[PDB]
């Protein structure tokens, strides 16, 4: 059944753009560095504009999948795959298309040593990440998710700063592969029952409570590694710290979102009965991760480790929201996911600004920076506040909505989750003050440069996006509520 779309801008062209960029960049000699830079940046920017147009034609009254286009695999047509988005995946496509040009711009100065391999790796990552978010099939979702492991492994290992990147890349690859292997088993068990992997059909098929429980456990084994939930989160600090800056931006801003996206797209709607049974279990794991990892963050001494550990606590608050199973909880969970991809990405950009100049991540060396880099200090303070979920910032909207949705279900989990307001404030301000405030230490650092024109421009869309969501989240919530409402109602008829 050729369910092709009538719109002019569709998902296939968006998936094809960065692929064309990579193919063209395959054949350009490494002496034409200017041309390589320009072509990569332009391909990413056109992809961003294309995704913005997809936003423009979005229809916010339907709970159906929009811009659905079919892609055929066999002329037998037994196995035929569909692409489409709804209010739950649209903004994540947008976020991917926006973060990739940032990743290219961050490594602009070193592009004479990075080479076309760096741009091609990021453009290939873009294609797979956009595709993952646009899949209406369990099997294609699985296959595209693992494809990102190859370029992410390459990015971490080749362009990481020090040789701990070896261990980091190994751990990342092995943990993620294990998780994806448990998902494969569940996909093949689903396919044994239903004879299909088409998501829309699965949303209309009934599962037994026993097999719902079991298949939910099989999905959890992958998603909890992706989120990450305790105690399988220890790969994250190594991988996100040893990666290059743009690698950290992609890892924390997009790849982390895949486990929570998988909870919203597959487990929660497809197995409603099992989801209710495991709700105290998810509540306990998330609450422990929020309290415990926030306290570990307090005692970290590496700049990138503090930011990496903060990401774990923010993502477990997201899981409390999505498993609250109401408009505020799921609505807040998606907004926090988007906000985190901007705030943590900006924070990894601040640390990279410091590291590119002085080549150290230890907090003890820094301090006093407000007297030499006031521009960086002001930008760093703003994203420090956004990381504390200050009202008026994008992160406060998602945070409070999740707490609202949790309070209406279980007042205890909402209380433990609200403890991150105290803990998250403690490590964010302690980090900012030890780096920016105080006096300089000329025996460690004596030569300083504030942000240049490229770094300031890089920070601009992050400030605008954070403010825009923090003061007027209605432009996002309006386009989501119809898909959110039907996700909550899935499996009940009263």
């Amino acid at each position: 059944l050729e369910h092709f779309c009538e719109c002019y801008f569709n998902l296939s062209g968006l998936i094809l753009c960065p692929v064309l960029g990579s193919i063209i960049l395959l054949f350009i000699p490494n002496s034409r560095i200017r041309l390589i830079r320009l072509i990569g940046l332009c391909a990413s920017l056109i992809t961003f504009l294309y995704s913005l147009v997809l936003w423009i034609q979005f229809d916010s009254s339907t709970a159906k999948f929009q811009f659905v286009e079919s892609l055929r695999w066999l002329p037998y047509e037994n196995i035929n795959f569909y692409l489409g988005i709804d209010g739950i995946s649209l903004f994540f496509v947008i976020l991917t298309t926006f973060l990739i040009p940032i990743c290219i711009l961050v490594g602009w100065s070193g592009m004479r040593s990075y080479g076309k391999e760096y741009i091609i790796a990021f453009l290939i990552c873009e294609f797979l990440m956009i595709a993952v978010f646009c899949m209406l099939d369990l099997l294609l979702f699985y296959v595209f998710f693992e494809s990102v492991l190859i370029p992410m492994f390459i990015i971490i290992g080749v362009w990481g700063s020090r040789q701990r990147k070896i261990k980091a890349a190994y751990q990342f690859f092995l943990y993620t592969l294990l998780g994806s292997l448990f998902m494969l088993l569940a996909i093949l068990l689903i396919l044994f029952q239903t004879g299909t992997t088409d998501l829309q059909i699965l949303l209309t098929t009934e599962f037994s409570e026993r097999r719902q429980i079991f298949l939910w456990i099989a999905f959890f084994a992958s998603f909890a590694v992706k989120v990450p939930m305790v105690p399988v989160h220890i790969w994250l600090p190594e991988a996100h710290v040893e990666a290059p800056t743009a690698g950290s931006v992609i890892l924390a801003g997009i790849l982390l979102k895949f486990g929570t996206y998988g909870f919203l797209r597959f487990s929660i709607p497809m197995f409603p009965e099992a989801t209710l049974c495991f709700t105290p279990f998810i509540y306990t794991l998330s609450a422990i991760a929020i309290i415990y990892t926030s306290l570990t963050t307090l005692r970290q001494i590496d700049l990138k480790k503090i930011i990496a550990y903060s990401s774990v606590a923010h993502m477990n608050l997201v899981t409390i929201g999505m498993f609250s199973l109401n408009i505020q909880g799921i609505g807040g969970s998606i907004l926090l996911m988007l906000s985190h991809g901007l705030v943590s990405s900006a924070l990894f950009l601040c640390v990279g600004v410091l590291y590119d100049r002085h080549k150290t991540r230890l907090v003890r060396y820094y301090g006093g920076l407000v007297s030499t880099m006031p521009n960086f200090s002001t930008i760093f303070f703003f994203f420090t506040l956004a990381n504390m979920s200050l009202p008026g910032t994008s992160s406060f909207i998602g945070e409070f909505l999740i707490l609202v949705g949790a309070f209406q279900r279980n007042s205890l989990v909402a209380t433990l989750a609200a403890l991150g307001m105290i803990l998250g404030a403690a490590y964010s301000l302690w980090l900012y003050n030890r780096v920016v405030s105080g006096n300089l230490k000329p025996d460690f650092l004596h030569k300083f440069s504030d942000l240049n024109g490229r770094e300031v421009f890089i920070f601009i869309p992050f400030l605008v996006g954070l403010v825009w969501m923090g003061v007027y989240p209605k432009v996002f919530l309006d386009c989501m509520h119809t898909s959110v409402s039907n996700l909550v109602q899935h499996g009940k008829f009263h």
Partner: protein
């Protein structure tokens, strides 16, 4: 005198590397056994039962039976 890179301190870097390599120091002592038992096992079970009990107390407030959980 030369460059923006930090002038490394051997004592501060040693403190940094000893932090990264903590897993080589774990020994399975008495204190660790108490700490892992209390905060790795006992406390999560306490939080789990508190959350279940919170749901159950709601069930008997609504005149409903105790909802089953895995």
């Amino acid at each position: 005198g030369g460059g923006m890179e930090t002038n490394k301190n051997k004592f501060i870097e040693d403190w940094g590397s000893a932090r990264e390599n903590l897993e080589h120091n774990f020994r399975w002592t008495r204190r660790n056994f108490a700490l892992i038992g209390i905060f790795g096992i006992a406390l999560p079970i306490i939080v789990y039962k508190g959350i279940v009990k919170d749901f159950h107390m709601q069930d008997e407030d609504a005149g409903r039976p105790h909802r089953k959980f895995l």
